[model samples]
Target: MNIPTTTTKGEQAKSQLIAAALAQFGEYGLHATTRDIAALAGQNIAAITYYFGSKEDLYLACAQWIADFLGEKFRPHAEKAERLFSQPAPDRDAIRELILLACKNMIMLLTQEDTVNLSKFISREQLSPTSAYQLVHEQVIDPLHTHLTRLVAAYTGCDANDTRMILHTHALLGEVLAFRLGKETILLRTGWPQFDEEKAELIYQTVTCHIDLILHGLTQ
Candidate 1:
């Protein structure tokens, strides 16, 4: 995505190239040609090499761009959850609220119209990880997963490193991942025309309900 606040022309050009690269790489994977990226960005072929060093470098830059894009959107809610758990002695109710907020944040962010390309890029990298995957994992996934796992551990009275806690955290997140991965099927199955505000509210409520059930089980 092009950083809208970029001031310098050089910065703008680089942002455009990254934005073009993301769309191309997200759709065509690493096989997307630098020529196509340049043309799509309305830049000269040499710009890719000039701005990002090489095609492979440019691909890695695209991964960083996706990470930064998602990080900017997700960090606030994640930090909120972090602060909740940072207290000396947060109650069980506070911990559950944090989990629900985390779930809601993921559901809302992933289902938004803008997240399509980012999600697609993420899916591709998961299937066939490259060097670019490192940037994404370091920048976004690792931190977020760690944060969620801590929350899960706190709620379940289990150690954060416990295998069962890890599995449960992933399973809870799977509830939100479904809407992004199975968006079309879900819309069709539910007979919803599109995921408008009302649809989003319905999803938010449903996912939170499921999360509550899971959390209740953990507390047992």
Candidate 2:
């Protein structure tokens, strides 16, 4: 736990603080004590004070960290898919692979037991949002919504900003998100068992099937 303390130290400390903060805030609601986060990061109680200046700042950083991490994983694939298609418009099978892979990767990250804390963290925001929630939505949520809209527009030959296109894309996104965030509810509703990798694969395939259906209906 050699903590750096230079100009660049802020970035390093900020990264460490967010990682710990993500786990703590995700596990316990934002209202929980910051003592737990400092302990998790193996830092002084004043670490958040020294680095972020407030608990709200640390929470916002945690939310942005999730977006940053996912962006790293998904951006390249998304860009490659977009480029490959506009030049010649890739075939159904190729487009299917890209869409499925991207969706699967997103669903996997959201549903994985190790990372399920993200769902819990977001659930708290949905349940009782604070000012930090608004910041996160502005920085991370809106950008992601826009990204998804663009991808759907490319695939469906619709204007990304169109109300119809946006709703269509959002419904598709809601499908995957529902399974990941509402596993228990889905189980109870459908009498399906608890979530597993096998079930996730099922969800992935079902989602792709639905996407294909939407593409067929929407694309000319």
Candidate 3:
């Protein structure tokens, strides 16, 4: 699932194509055009063939781009959460703080101006999944869900593997996602032009409070 780093001119071109393909496939899905993506990247159409084989493969590469992009973004924070959870009888507050911070960063990233197309890519995948969905789910989604879910499970004494706990984590995440996927409602009500950092912080606080309540209710 790894794409070449932009270390050399050739790999730089590969990244250029991957990022452009990301925006295109996210918006148009199977209808995305390789020629346009190449043109947008200022590369020849055959570059797609040279780098990613075909439009179909480019779409998968785009998915991998997304998976790797998001996976790395939260890696440090998620790693922090994991390190804390590795301790014996980790404090609930300590654990959930990482979750809160994770949510905070996630809120900012999801609503960031640059990542809209990536979000669209994820949305379309959720509605009607493709093979790319499996890669994302396994590599990115599962680890994230499991990390946060296990944090909650530990506090609540709930079974981490249970479907119920899984949905609990999903619901917690859904609250965070509304600020992105359902941003229109929030923005319309607030009369904001867009989700700037301050606006995103507001949702970060709001979603964190909700998780606090649920985690508290679950545990005690």
Candidate 4:
């Protein structure tokens, strides 16, 4: 969320700009104020105009940033899983563990308060999408989901176009997304305390367990 601190000034600035955008957009729509973003980013209002040119440009950048982050993180897993399918019968258990590990990494990444809030902002944009949606979809979601679904289909021995396969892949993705997408309900229903590292690990374990069970059922 804060650009991981090990980043360069440009990188940090870009991340801060997005963070500022997330906070402002979550509070106010695109037009409410760039002043809020400037304040959040610890920059003058001209910073937005200087770095991003316009609010629309900033929003578009945020969309692409998230998409690129997801793409970079999960691409290897998808490739490996698909390659495994080409080999002899893969160990379903190892594959499940791989899935769990991927989920764990993603959960750790997204559990940051800023990441979660950014996600909420993304959701808001999707609900009433502007140009950024199309930009992100083309540059990010299309390729990412296509390959992910391919990997799942290959691993599960399902046809990509099959309704059952689609359902299965969706189920797998849903399990991962559910944590953040429905996080509040999950916390409320399960009485998990608010966000802490320990609680986060516990939830990751729970989600991974669910994923393993589903994969087991499908592989058999």
Candidate 5:
């Protein structure tokens, strides 16, 4: 535990710390200690400072790390969304396709075993944001919300820059968020043990239906 931080050039050591810290911070929030995190990673406590400088720095780094992780995970869908956005006159069907694609991708991501900690870490940041939240929002949500808002505008024949459109986009996304964040209630109500592939399909179909209904309501 007293080992001084060493700048080991091995990236394996660095990534190990991030993985452990991701779980620690996700489970315990900022109250988690360096010794606990380093111990979990089976590294000297000083590995934290060597790799991240300080406890606070580690937290921020993990935020950016997960943000980048999520950014990359969702990149394929995002690139397609970007392509659709570039069309000078996109049909509503094209816009809906992008929306459904992104939503299904989201369901696939949030329901994974690996993303359990990643989601918890972000859930904490969301309830009461810190610098970590700031970095995550900048790295991930900002661009996501932007594209989604544009898609909503296209679907509704509304101005993309309108504040109402932004709210509408968020409200739509919040429906998807409910399955992840409100898992306990959903499971209880559905008499399900846990979210699995079948459950994921249910969510996809349920949310897709809602989105379709909302689109109908919005347009007409």
Candidate 6:
């Protein structure tokens, strides 16, 4: 990923540009104009170049910002999981607890507006792989996936890099992502007005239950 070439003058401008880019890119994709971004950020169009070097560079910065935003939220739980795994032998229960820790943080993240937009931004990159995608995958997705993969391996006695274990870890995360991805359908189908605290808790419980069911199936 070609990140930005920075300067002291560009610091604040870069922050504004990334914020503007997040909204624009989420709404309009990569084709969103520098003109629109500058207007939104209250900076001149030239500020994009001055701060981020190019529109594509700005996009990659936004991608990194989005990943970092989520990565910050996920880090505490991920670190806890790592500590658990560093033990001489983490049992299946410890592994399951680690999985739940990750799931809870992810579900909680979906409840926040900023995280939702951040998710949308990364979800777009995931649709079409690019250098920006590599940045996000390495900085955010891969590390989180690896943490869960380790937990899965510990629980199932499969190698951490086993394709089956990796796929299963992703599938488990899909359960958490379903809420944000299918927000409208879920709200309408369930007759919920919005994803309020109670609704979010319901979703969390449902995901954990599903994970338990899946673990049972895997072990049997």
TM-score of each: 0.90, 0.75, 0.93, 0.78, 0.92, 0.89
Cα distance off (Å), candidate 3, residue 29: 0.6
Each model's total of backbone clashes: 0, 0, 0, 0, 0, 0
Per-residue error (Å), model 3, residue 100: 0.6
Candidate 3 matches the true fold with a TM-score of 0.93
Arranged by lDDT, best first: 5, 3, 1, 6, 2, 4
Between candidates 2 and 3, the one scoring higher on lDDT is 3
lDDT of 5 at 210: 94
RMSD of each: 2.7, 4.2, 1.8, 4.1, 3.5, 2.5
- Please name the candidate that would achieve the greatest TM-score relative to the true structure: 3
Per-residue lDDT tens digits of candidate 4, residues 28-57?
767658887888888788867767788877
Lowest lDDT sum, 10 consecutive residues, model 4, at 1-10
Clashes of 1: 0
Query: For model 1, which pairs clash?
Result: none
* Candidate 6 lowest-lDDT run of ten: 1-10
lDDT per prediction?
0.82, 0.72, 0.85, 0.71, 0.85, 0.81
Candidate 5's C-alpha runs over 4 A off are 1-9
Count of backbone collisions in candidate 4: 0
